[PDB]
Structures are given as structure tokens and as C-alpha cells.
Design a protein around this ligand. Structure first.
Ligand SMILES: Cc1ncc(COP(=O)(O)O)c(CN[C@H](C(=O)O)[C@H](C)O)c1O
Ligand SMILES: Cc1ncc(COP(=O)(O)O)c(CN[C@H](C(=O)O)[C@H](C)O)c1O
Lengths: 405, 405
């Protein structure tokens, strides 16, 4: 940076702290990642100066010849990445991507079926304090109490009982592969649209390591950050038959001007994901996740569903008589970043929880491998099995320091 | 840029075109501006890597110590700038800022009173193809057919007749000062909340050149770009009594994770606006607007309302027997960027229009002054009075080139 340090010392100082923190900590929040310098440069571009309401070649303001090229590069790359017939790369966020799909196919008060929020469903999949739960009538399907795998017969019974206009699949904390084929079969049975929110798994989808929802879902939403390793923002994929309606839902329906500099950064991230080394990266993410799961089981930890098929894992801390909140706090003390997370049929509130959620996408990006996975697991065991030992915590601190260099 | 040119030649080429276009054209779209290099650097920062759901010191994810400082700097600077009791700097856009206020005080189907969309009201103030018009029952107040000034007796009659739960004031194409005191008096008469969308005039408010809605409105929304000359995004100001409810409306109500890098850029822009030279800049914006209005009247053009009190002006092209669409197109041919804009009681559709909207915020930022205003007006007259003369258009082209260097 050149101009920010001179113009705004206060803001620069805090940014510089944050940069150093990102290097110093072991980042295990499942939704987090580190973007390339190219992605950041696109975001820090003069494209923030362009007002571009409308769509490429169909703008409502002149001067958009070049931002049109940028947006089309994003849409075409997204379509190549996911094999979708149409992309909308303007959603400001995953929340707004979801909002737009809901706005497209639902009237106020329509019934929607989504994954139980305490079994892995997202805020925007029907929380009663989110627009989704307030605007529409959400009902929920559950995972099996033993396997912690989605109970497809419960999905089907809930659909047949409640007759939703829309079924939503995908999750913020589900460590197994989702069966989109079964979701579409149920959707077809009850005459419901199927929406897949693939935010967490989108990078893995792109790399052929998770089944692609696109051929099964009427609408696929996602964030561009997370496993896809792009800028913070949303995206909607769909077949050509819904393209016009989805585009009108984004604008003029729920947004105004798009963030053209963020869309440039989306195009950049999509370009990166189309490359072979992103495929290699993504396999290391899943490989690392499986290795981490195994090493945690080796320390004596119980994992929700017994392990992982993706980038993320959930530790059920009940056997250690710990809440997720306690574990989160103590891990924070040693420089490991997790979040407390409800587990299926959690006896604790969402603010306390009986689990922690852990993902490998961030640590994999910085070059951590299987040996680092073993060591992370060993540090977690050291800390959680000795929460009252300041000496154990100091040793943990020093081992975390050795990992991040 | 260093990494983007190497990693993504296609995206870099289009960005580079856009950069050169920004320098080459005369940008007169009223909502546009050019941000500082410090603002862009903040946007291109590693803060895009941080997930920060919740609010400063009340986050739902760890590691937010430093992004908390950044957000607080934005909120405190905003509060100092506008004298507001509470700021929310997380809205992704002006659309989302508006959506959140509506979400806070309205139920589905509530009556809202806003400015007639073809008299200067915004899309999000009740368009029937926008969430606002679909979710709530919007009724409209008008400007006087002669003066083109808001008819405060019509505001009052519409409020008393329709009994709105919320009155909205502010505009995308109103060239006179808005009387917030009268809006609040009417609101108080009918027991309605008052919301002011100050997006266009926020920089002028900050500089003491437009009356401040904050002491009169329950809720003030705005964009951070436009006259405020910051990054693209939204903001809500309000008194402390509504702080908690506004914050919950943004999250968990209508968004998820905030754009911390954009919030850093907001803090930067707010820091700039607190400085004396931003005050001097803003006066030049209004000074230039008045001078431009006068010089256009000198060319024989009719202006909506007879001139301007702010950064923007509307030309009523009916006397020249031109539509706004025709004028927009021909000005585009010579390198002047305007938009077609409906005028009050426009006989044409919103897609054709009888006017063009012109603002000076962008040209003022690049250092244009009164003499440049006279020349811009002279070029506009040359072009619009000779739409069929390729020689007039070439001369216009060369004079535009002389202005932008
Ligand atoms: C499945 C899923 N979809 C959307 C989003 C949020 O998108 P945005 O933040 O851009 O509005 C999420 C967010 N998930 C968070 C995370 O996993 O850490 C958290 C649970 O909100 C999501 O999971
Ligand atoms: C008064 C007013 N409020 C909000 C916005 C849009 O905010 P965002 O684009 O970040 O969602 C606008 C936009 N106005 C545009 C412009 O003036 O050029 C256009 C009329 O939509 C606004 O005017």
C-alpha cells in the first residue's frame, strides 16, 4: 500500500494488525480462506467508480462497454466451471443470492422445506429472526440421530405432509455428501422447485470432488468466497428457462447497482478455479479434512457422522464434558480459530453448543499438508484434554507458532 | 497492479480499458464519482478474508479484534460527520439499507408514502417491479406541475388519506433542497415514521451545504458512493432508541457476513469527508452545478424547477423536440456521459423520457471549475442543436478531448 498509510494511519494500523493476525493464527473456521493477490487487486480497482445497473449489453446507464466484458467473463467462466446454462454474478452476498431465488418463485407466506438449522441448515434457510423465516413458512427435515446423515425419508415425509412450493438443500455444517438426485426425486413427487445452496462446497463441486447440484436443481446459489476461494459475494446458477426471471429478481427486484470491482474479482477467482492446480488444491483440502478427522479420532474425539466426505468436520464434545463455547475460547487462547457449532439433537442452546466446527480450506491454501493435519489434531487434544493447565496451553501456543512460522 | 496482469490478461485488459475510459470521457451521471487511491487500497485489502457476522465486540466468530477497530472507526466517523446517535455501516448497498429499515418498522402489506418515481423517487421507494412495491403498499406524492418543487400539501393530503405507517423522503433526480422539517411535521400529524434516503445528497449534507435530515428523521439511509465519494455500499443512521432493532434488521435479518474491506474503505472515505478540503470540494460541486445550470439556460435549455440547489440538474428537452434517449445517445457519440431521465409529468415512457439528468460531483473531483462548466454547457448546446451534423459532432468530440486532456 502507498496512499492509505499516509492518508489514514488509524485504518492502515488496523489493517496491518489484521494481515499479521491472518499469518499468525491457525484458521480453522470452515467458511474461511485466503484469496490471491490478483483477486484483491481486482477488488481494489477503479471499477468501484462505475455505475452499471442492468446486465451486459442491456445496461440502463452508458459507458459500460468494458465492465460488460468483465461481467461476461465472470458469467462464462462460472458456466464453464459448473456446467450451468445461466449465471448471475451480481448478488452482493450468499444471503442476497438466496433472497432473489425466494423472490423469484415464492409469494409471501409460501411453505418452504429446508434443513434443520441445528442439524446444519443456514440462517437464510428459514431462521425465525431472518427474512427467510419471517417472509415464508419454513418447515425442516432432519438428520438421523445416530448416523447424522440426512434422513431422506424424513425429507420425503415432510415434503408430502407440508406440500412446500420450494425444497432447499445444502448446509453450513454438514460433513457428508448431499444426494441431490434424491432431493430432486422428492421435489418432483410433490411438485416443488429444488434450490441447492452450495456455498460451502462450491470449490469442491468445481474440482469434481463433490456431486454437482446443477443438473438436479432448478436453482443453485452460492457464495464466491469459502471453498471457491474468491471475493466475498454471491452467485446464482440456473437453466435458461429461469434466466430472465432470476436476472429480474436480482435487478430490479432486490438490488440496484452491482459491485463491478467485486465482479471482476469473481471472474479472477473463477479463472483460477478453471486451472489444474486449483483441482490439486481442492483434493488436498478434502485429503487434509479426512486426515484431520482421523487424527482427531486418534486423540479420542467423537466426530459428527463419524468423519467427513468434504472440507469440514464437527467434533461432538459431550464425551469430554465440554461445550463448544468453552472449547472455542480455550483454542482462541493458543492461536487456533474454530467456531462453536450446534450438533444434531444438541442438548445445549445455539449460543453454547456441544460442538466445534473445523474446516481445512484456509490452512490448505497456506500449504499445510497431512503432517500438519496430524500436528493440529495433536495440539487440539493437548488443549481440550488439559483446559486447566496453563503449561499445556503455553506448549500448545508454541506448537501453533512452530506451524505458522 | 502486479499480479493481475500476469494471472489474468483478459480481466486486466478490460480493467485497463475502463481506467482509460474514466479519464477520457466527461462523466456527468449524477450518482457517479471517483474515489481516492486510499479508498481503493482499503478495498483491495486482506480484510476480504475475514468472516465477521455480528457487530464490533459482539461477533459470532473469533479473530475479529482488528476488523472491530475498522468497523468502529467507520461508525464513529459517520456519527461525527452527520451528528447521528447510531450508525450501521454494514449494508451491502443503498438498496439493502432501505430494505432493512422497511424490515424494521413494516409488516408485509403496510402502506408507505414515497415520492412519485417519475418525479424523482427511487426504484426502492415503491417500484412495482422492486421488492418495495411488491412487499408493501406504496402510495406517492408529487411535485408541482409548474415549479417542479415537492408539493408539501400533496404530501400531507396523501398521508392523511392513506394513513401510511412510514413516509419516505429523498430522491434520485430532485434538484432542489428537501424540507425535512415539513416531512416530519406531516409524519407526526398522521403518526408515521419518517425515513430519509439521502444517497444523492449525503456529501453535501456532510459539508453543511444541504439541510441535515438526521435531527428530523427516525431513520436516514444512504449510499457511501455518490456525493460522499466513498466505496459502493450502504449505511443507516438513526437515534439510539432504534439502534438495536436496525442492527438486528441488517443481521440476522437481511444480510450475513459484512464486507469488512468495503467497511474499511467506508471509514477511509468518512475520514476524508471530515477534512476541510472535502468541504471546499463539496462547495465547488454545488457552485459548478449552479454555473452549469446557468450556462445551459444561456444556451436556451429549459431546466426542471428552473435550476438547482444541489449537485444535480434535469434538462426538459421538449422545447428542442428531443427525447432524453436521443440526447443521451448523441452525447455518448462525442464523449459526454449523461442519462435519460423522466421529468415531472413526462409525456414519454421511462424508457424514452423527455429529459437528461446531469450532475457535477465527478467532474468537480477531477478539478473542473466554473470555466469548464461554461464549456461543457457550450458543447451540449452545440450537439443538441445540431444532432444531424457530423461536423458539429466532430467539433464537440475535439472540445471534449481538450477538456479531459
Ligand atoms: C450455505 C450458506 N449460504 C450462504 C451463506 C452466507 O452468505 P453471505 O455471508 O455472503 O451472506 C452461508 C454462511 N455461512 C456462515 C459460515 O458457514 O461460517 C455462517 C454459518 O453464517 C452459508 O453457510
Ligand atoms: C436515493 C437513492 N438511494 C439508493 C440508491 C441505490 O443504492 P445501490 O445502487 O447501492 O443499491 C439510489 C440509486 N440511484 C441511481 C442513480 O441515481 O443513478 C439510479 C436512479 O438507480 C438512489 O438514487
Amino acid at each position: 500500500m502507498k496512499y492509505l498509510p499516509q492518508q489514514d494511519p488509524q485504518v492502515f494500523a488496523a489493517i496491518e494488525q489484521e494481515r499479521k493476525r491472518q499469518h499468525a493464527k491457525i484458521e480453522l473456521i470452515a467458511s474461511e480462506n485466503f484469496v490471491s493477490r490478483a483477486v484483491m487487486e481486482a477488488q481494489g480497482s477503479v471499477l468501484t467508480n462505475k455505475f452499471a445497473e442492468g446486465y451486459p449489453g442491456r445496461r440502463y446507464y452508458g459507458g459500460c462497454e468494458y465492465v460488460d466484458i468483465v461481467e461476461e467473463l465472470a458469467r462464462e467462466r462460472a458456466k464453464q466451471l459448473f456446467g450451468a446454462e445461466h449465471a448471475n454474478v451480481q448478488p452482493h452476498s450468499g444471503a442476497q443470492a438466496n433472497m432473489a431465488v425466494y423472490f423469484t418463485v415464492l409469494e409471501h407466506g409460501d411453505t418452504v422445506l429446508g434443513m434443520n438449522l441445528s442439524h446444519g441448515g443456514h440462517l437464510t434457510h428459514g431462521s425465525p429472526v431472518n427474512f427467510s423465516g419471517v417472509q415464508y413458512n419454513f418447515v425442516a427435515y432432519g438428520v438421523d440421530p445416530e448416523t447424522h446423515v440426512i434422513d431422506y425419508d424424513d425429507v420425503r415425509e415432510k415434503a408430502r405432509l407440508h406440500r412446500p412450493k420450494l425444497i432447499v438443500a445444502a448446509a453450513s455444517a454438514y460433513p457428508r455428501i448431499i444426494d441431490f438426485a434424491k432431493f430432486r426425486e422428492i421435489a418432483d413427487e410433490v411438485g416443488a422447485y429444488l434450490m441447492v445452496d452450495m456455498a460451502h462446497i462450491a470449490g469442491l463441486v468445481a474440482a469434481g470432488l463433490h456431486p454437482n447440484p446443477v443438473p438436479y436443481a432448478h436453482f443453485v446459489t452460492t457464495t464466491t468466497h469459502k471453498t471457491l476461494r474468491g471475493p466475498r459475494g454471491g452467485m446464482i446458477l440456473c437453466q435458461e428457462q429461469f434466466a430472465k426471471q432470476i436476472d429480474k429478481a436480482i435487478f430490479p427486484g432486490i438490488q440496484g447497482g452491482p459491485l463491478m470491482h467485486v465482479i471482476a474479482a469473481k471472474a479472477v477467482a473463477f479463472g483460477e478455479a478453471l486451472q489444474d492446480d486449483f483441482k490439486a488444491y481442492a483434493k488436498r483440502v478434502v485429503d487434509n479434512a479426512k486426515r484431520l478427522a482421523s487424527a482427531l479420532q486418534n486423540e479420542g474425539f467423537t466426530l459428527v457422522s463419524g468423519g467427513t466426505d468434504n472440507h469440514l468436520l464437527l467434533v461432538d464434545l459431550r464425551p469430554q464434558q465440554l461445550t463448544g463455547k468453552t472449547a472455542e475460547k480455550v483454542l482462541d487462547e493458543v492461536g487456533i480459530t474454530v467456531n462453536k457449532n450446534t450438533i444434531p439433537y444438541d442438548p445445549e442452546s445455539p449460543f453454547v453448543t456441544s460442538g466445534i466446527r473445523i474446516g481445512t480450506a484456509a490452512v490448505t491454501t497456506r500449504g499445510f499438508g497431512l503432517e500438519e493435519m496430524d500436528e493440529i489434531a495433536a495440539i487440539i487434544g493437548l488443549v481440550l484434554k488439559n483446559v486447566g493447565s496453563e503449561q499445556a496451553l503455553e506448549e500448545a501456543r508454541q506448537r501453533v507458532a512452530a506451524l505458522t512460522d
